[PDB]
Structure formats: structure tokens, C-alpha cells
Amino acid sequence: MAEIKHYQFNVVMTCSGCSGAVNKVLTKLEPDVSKIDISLEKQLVDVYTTLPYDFILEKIKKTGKEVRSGKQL
Numbered sequence: 001m002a003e004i005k006h007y008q009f010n011v012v013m014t015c016s017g018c019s020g021a022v023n024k025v026l027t028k029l030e031p032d033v034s035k036i037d038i039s040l041e042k043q044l045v046d047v048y049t050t051l052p053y054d055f056i057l058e059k060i061k062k063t064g065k066e067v068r069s070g071k072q073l
């Protein structure tokens, strides 16, 4: 089992690429993740999933940008 928790991350999404790259990573997590939202303006990324915090932090930064911080909700 897992329940869907709401994670929020701040990733340094300044180039018109990394947004797409994270999104592409999301495309693999889709059949597990419940919901996603992504914001360049406010340099933040909200993901509603089962998968643990650390996994997502890695997954995000993996794409190239740094992950500044995040939290769970």
C-alpha cells in the first residue's frame, strides 16, 4: 500500500529545458503518481504521490538543475 501525499519542491527551473526534463521524468512516474503541477514563475514543483520525498528530490535534480529545498503535505 501507500497513500498519495502532496510533496512540494523548489527546483532551479530557469532555462527553457529543465521544466520539460522534469516533466519527462514525471512521464515515467505517471503510473504511480496521482497528480502533478509545475511552476517556472515561482520556481516550484508540486507532486501528489505515494513515492517517498527523497526519490522525488533525486528524480528532479537528476534532470540537470539543482533542487533547492522541499516539504511534504
Ligand SMILES: [Cu+]
Pocket: 012, 013, 014, 015, 016, 017, 018, 019, 065
Ligand atoms: Cu533550467
